[PDB]
Amino acid sequence: TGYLTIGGQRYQAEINDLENLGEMGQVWKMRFRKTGHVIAVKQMRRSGNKEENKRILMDLDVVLKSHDCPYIVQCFGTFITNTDVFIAMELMGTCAEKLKKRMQGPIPERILGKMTVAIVKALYYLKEKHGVIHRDVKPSNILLDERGQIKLSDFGISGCAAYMAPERIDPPRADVWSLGISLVELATGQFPYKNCKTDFEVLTKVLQEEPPLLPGHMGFSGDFQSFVKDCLTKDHRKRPKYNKLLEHSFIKRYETLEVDVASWFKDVMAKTES
Ligand SMILES: C=CC(=O)Nc1cccc(-c2n[nH]c3cc(C)ccc23)c1
Numbered sequence: 001t002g003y004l005t006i007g008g009q010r011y012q013a014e015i016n017d018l019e020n021l022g023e024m025g026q027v028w029k030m031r032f033r034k035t036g037h038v039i040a041v042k043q044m045r046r047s048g049n050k051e052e053n054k055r056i057l058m059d060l061d062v063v064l065k066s067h068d069c070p071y072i073v074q075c076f077g078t079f080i081t082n083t084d085v086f087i088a089m090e091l092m093g094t095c096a097e098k099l100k101k102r103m104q105g106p107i108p109e110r111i112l113g114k115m116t117v118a119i120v121k122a123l124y125y126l127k128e129k130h131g132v133i134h135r136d137v138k139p140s141n142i143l144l145d146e147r148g149q150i151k152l153s154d155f156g157i158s159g160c161a162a163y164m165a166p167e168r169i170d171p172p173r174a175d176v177w178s179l180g181i182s183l184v185e186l187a188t189g190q191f192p193y194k195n196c197k198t199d200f201e202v203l204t205k206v207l208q209e210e211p212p213l214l215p216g217h218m219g220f221s222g223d224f225q226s227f228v229k230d231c232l233t234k235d236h237r238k239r240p241k242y243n244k245l246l247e248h249s250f251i252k253r254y255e256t257l258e259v260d261v262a263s264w265f266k267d268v269m270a271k272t273e274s
Pocket of ligand 1 (some may be wrong): 027040042073089090091092093094095096097098139140141143153154
């Protein structure tokens, strides 16, 4: 048996209550037959790689404990069989990484605004309420949906060289750096450290190069440019805390501003492929 809490109700569910619609550790898009909800179902194989499995179990542990955060992807329930665990997860439309790829470039600042609000809050929530750092903030872990919701995913290592903070590469808030890097990536359409062929080469550029700020010739708001400059403060002791960042003007504006993220998302998903 499994118990799913989904759409406000509690169900006893059998693995047969899930209709597999295909693949997307191992993830299936599945329809729940008792309701018509379409969900993401992760499989943990008893016979799988033990490192993957413990990563999965860590993500699961954070996610279960984050039921009260609406900026973190929700788990509806689990099914344990003799050989497998199936994990029912909130299905999103796509990630920020896939949106960059489809768009062939810049996501508009107003969307990066809403995204920034949501991700900083998810991050803040798990620092405050659970003492958890994410350790792998990047665009593939930032998810969006048709309802204009933006959420954080994947806490299995609660980490990609590309988005590593300077103090993580060389130690005397590293998550805030990685956020900064993602935003520059997504606002300009280009991952800021160019033509790196290996992980260590990106690490080298992080440390030797100037922070990769938003380009002045793109007419980004000063708000946004300053938010990034604060996040991309290489000296971590000088880089701001979530509670400081929550009052940054960039966050405060897009928090109170009305942005139709859903129509933008629906329209961009329509007008593109892959
Ligand atoms: C950019 C890579 C990617 O993960 N894409 C993507 C595209 C569409 C939906 C999901 C997704 N929705 N819900 C999830 C829950 C987990 C644990 C992982 C991925 C998803 C993920």
